[PDB]
RNA sequence: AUUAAGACAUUCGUGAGUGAUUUAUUUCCAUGAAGUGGCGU
C-alpha cells in the first residue's frame, strides 16, 4: 500500500478535469482547462505492507497493519524533478486531441470530435 | 377694684376617583456529503 500525501498540507483532493455527460443514451466527453495550482507541487509517498493472514478462527478479521518497509527516498533529486513532483506543463486540450487520435488499425476510444 | 370679667380660629372631612409598560420588529443571510481507484503491464 502506497499512501500519497501532499508534502505540506496544501493539496488534499482534485476532481477529475474530464466530465462525462450522458444525454438521451449518448456519451459526451467535455472539459475546460485544468486547475494550474496542481502543477509543480510536491508529493510524499509512504510505503506500507499489509499481509492479510489466515483468519484467527475467532474474528475472521484484519489486524494485518503493523508492517512498514523503509525504501529509498529521492527528495529534491535531479533539482526537484522526480516522482515527488507534477509535470508543471500540461494542456488538457492538447492531451485530449492526442488521445482518440492514437490508433492501431483503428482509433482506440471511438469518439468523434465536435470540439469547440 | 382700674371704661372691668369671662371665651382654644373650633366641629365635621380617607389625596381620591377612571388608567394592561403598551403599539411595532422573520434568529436571518452563505456554502455541492462531496474527491479518488489500483495492482493483475
Short mmCIF file of C-alpha atoms (C1' of nucleotides) in Angstrom, two decimals:
data_model
loop_
_atom_site.label_atom_id
_atom_site.label_comp_id
_atom_site.label_asym_id
_atom_site.label_seq_id
_atom_site.Cartn_x
_atom_site.Cartn_y
_atom_site.Cartn_z
CA UNK A 1 0.00 0.00 0.00
CA UNK A 2 1.45 3.34 -1.09
CA UNK A 3 -0.06 6.26 0.80
CA UNK A 4 0.07 9.53 -1.16
CA UNK A 5 0.00 12.85 0.68
CA UNK A 6 0.95 16.44 -0.11
CA UNK A 7 4.37 17.38 1.25
CA UNK A 8 2.81 20.35 3.02
CA UNK A 9 -0.87 20.39 3.89
CA UNK A 10 -1.85 22.39 0.81
CA UNK A 11 -3.31 19.84 -1.64
CA UNK A 12 -5.89 17.33 -0.43
CA UNK A 13 -8.07 16.42 -3.44
CA UNK A 14 -8.58 17.04 -7.14
CA UNK A 15 -11.71 16.43 -9.17
CA UNK A 16 -11.15 14.71 -12.49
CA UNK A 17 -10.93 17.56 -15.04
CA UNK A 18 -12.90 15.46 -17.53
CA UNK A 19 -16.70 15.44 -17.38
CA UNK A 20 -18.90 12.69 -18.83
CA UNK A 21 -22.38 13.81 -19.90
CA UNK A 22 -24.96 11.14 -20.75
CA UNK A 23 -27.93 12.62 -22.61
CA UNK A 24 -30.53 10.51 -24.44
CA UNK A 25 -28.29 7.42 -24.35
CA UNK A 26 -25.36 9.33 -25.89
CA UNK A 27 -21.97 9.82 -24.23
CA UNK A 28 -20.39 13.28 -24.31
CA UNK A 29 -16.87 13.94 -23.04
CA UNK A 30 -16.38 17.61 -22.17
CA UNK A 31 -13.84 19.65 -20.27
CA UNK A 32 -12.32 23.05 -19.63
CA UNK A 33 -8.67 23.63 -18.74
CA UNK A 34 -7.21 22.01 -15.64
CA UNK A 35 -6.52 23.82 -12.38
CA UNK A 36 -2.94 25.04 -12.77
CA UNK A 37 -2.45 25.01 -8.99
CA UNK A 38 -1.63 21.29 -9.04
CA UNK A 39 1.31 21.75 -11.43
CA UNK A 40 4.79 21.71 -9.84
CA UNK A 41 3.55 20.58 -6.44
CA UNK A 42 5.44 18.29 -4.04
CA UNK A 43 4.05 14.90 -3.05
CA UNK A 44 5.12 12.45 -0.36
CA UNK A 45 4.91 8.66 -0.53
CA UNK A 46 4.62 6.36 2.49
CA UNK A 47 5.02 2.65 1.75
CA UNK A 48 3.13 0.21 3.97
CA UNK A 49 2.94 -3.59 3.89
CA UNK A 50 -0.38 -5.30 4.63
CA UNK A 51 -0.20 -9.10 4.86
CA UNK A 52 -3.75 -10.43 5.13
CA UNK A 53 -3.22 -13.58 7.17
CA UNK A 54 -5.38 -16.60 7.85
CA UNK A 55 -8.45 -15.94 9.96
CA UNK A 56 -7.86 -16.34 13.69
CA UNK A 57 -10.96 -18.61 13.91
CA UNK A 58 -12.50 -16.06 16.30
CA UNK A 59 -12.96 -12.79 14.40
CA UNK A 60 -12.03 -13.68 10.81
CA UNK A 61 -10.97 -10.03 10.53
CA UNK A 62 -7.97 -7.90 9.56
CA UNK A 63 -5.36 -6.62 12.01
CA UNK A 64 -2.59 -7.05 9.43
CA UNK A 65 -1.33 -3.48 9.65
CA UNK A 66 1.83 -3.40 11.77
CA UNK A 67 4.28 -3.63 8.89
CA UNK A 68 6.11 -0.87 7.02
CA UNK A 69 9.24 -1.18 4.87
CA UNK A 70 11.77 1.65 4.64
CA UNK A 71 12.67 2.17 0.98
CA UNK A 72 14.88 4.85 -0.54
CA UNK A 73 13.68 8.45 -0.83
CA UNK A 74 14.71 10.89 -3.57
CA UNK A 75 13.51 14.28 -2.36
CA UNK A 76 14.83 17.22 -4.43
CA UNK A 77 16.56 14.64 -6.65
CA UNK A 78 17.57 15.97 -10.08
CA UNK A 79 16.82 19.55 -8.97
CA UNK A 80 13.23 18.89 -7.84
CA UNK A 81 12.38 16.83 -10.92
CA UNK A 82 11.47 13.35 -9.64
CA UNK A 83 8.49 11.20 -8.72
CA UNK A 84 7.63 13.70 -5.96
CA UNK A 85 6.58 16.48 -8.37
CA UNK A 86 3.98 17.18 -11.06
CA UNK A 87 4.94 17.81 -14.71
CA UNK A 88 4.48 21.64 -14.36
CA UNK A 89 3.35 21.87 -18.01
CA UNK A 90 0.14 20.35 -19.36
CA UNK A 91 -2.80 21.41 -21.53
CA UNK A 92 -5.96 19.32 -21.34
CA UNK A 93 -6.94 20.25 -24.91
CA UNK A 94 -3.61 19.04 -26.33
CA UNK A 95 -3.69 15.73 -24.46
CA UNK A 96 -7.36 15.19 -25.33
CA UNK A 97 -6.56 15.75 -29.01
CA UNK A 98 -3.59 13.38 -28.72
CA UNK A 99 -5.98 10.79 -27.31
CA UNK A 100 -8.65 9.49 -29.69
CA UNK A 101 -6.05 10.07 -32.37
CA UNK A 102 -3.73 7.32 -31.10
CA UNK A 103 -4.58 4.21 -33.08
CA UNK A 104 -3.54 0.85 -34.44
CA UNK A 105 -5.57 -0.24 -37.49
CA UNK A 106 -8.38 1.80 -35.96
CA UNK A 107 -8.64 4.52 -33.32
CA UNK A 108 -8.99 3.25 -29.75
CA UNK A 109 -11.53 5.47 -27.97
CA UNK A 110 -14.25 5.50 -30.62
CA UNK A 111 -15.31 9.14 -30.17
CA UNK A 112 -15.55 11.65 -32.99
CA UNK A 113 -14.56 15.26 -32.48
CA UNK A 114 -17.17 18.06 -32.30
CA UNK A 115 -14.90 20.15 -30.05
CA UNK A 116 -15.49 23.90 -29.94
"C1'" A B 1 -61.00 97.17 92.26
"C1'" U B 2 -58.67 100.20 87.28
"C1'" U B 3 -64.43 102.27 80.83
"C1'" A B 4 -63.87 95.77 84.26
"C1'" A B 5 -64.75 89.96 83.90
"C1'" G B 6 -65.38 85.64 81.14
"C1'" A B 7 -64.14 83.00 75.57
"C1'" C B 8 -58.59 77.03 72.29
"C1'" A B 9 -59.99 80.06 64.86
"C1'" U B 10 -63.01 75.48 66.95
"C1'" U B 11 -66.79 70.96 64.98
"C1'" C B 12 -67.49 67.80 60.60
"C1'" G B 13 -63.81 65.99 56.21
"C1'" U B 14 -59.71 58.94 53.51
"C1'" G B 15 -55.46 62.90 48.40
"C1'" A B 16 -59.44 60.40 45.94
"C1'" G B 17 -61.92 58.83 41.51
"C1'" U B 18 -61.23 56.31 35.69
"C1'" G B 19 -55.72 54.20 33.79
"C1'" A B 20 -52.79 46.12 30.83
"C1'" U B 21 -45.46 49.26 30.21
"C1'" U B 22 -48.06 49.06 25.74
"C1'" U B 23 -48.09 49.65 19.76
"C1'" A B 24 -44.21 47.91 16.06
"C1'" U B 25 -39.65 44.30 14.70
"C1'" U B 26 -38.81 36.71 10.48
"C1'" U B 27 -32.65 34.29 14.81
"C1'" C B 28 -31.88 35.62 9.03
"C1'" C B 29 -28.01 35.79 5.05
"C1'" A B 30 -23.51 31.92 2.71
"C1'" U B 31 -21.95 27.27 1.44
"C1'" G B 32 -22.22 20.71 -3.85
"C1'" A B 33 -21.89 14.98 1.73
"C1'" A B 34 -18.54 15.56 -1.58
"C1'" G B 35 -12.80 13.87 -4.02
"C1'" U B 36 -10.36 9.50 -5.61
"C1'" G B 37 -9.05 3.52 -7.58
"C1'" G B 38 -5.03 0.43 -8.25
"C1'" C B 39 -2.27 -3.77 -8.98
"C1'" G B 40 -3.19 -8.20 -12.27
"C1'" U B 41 1.86 -4.10 -17.80
#
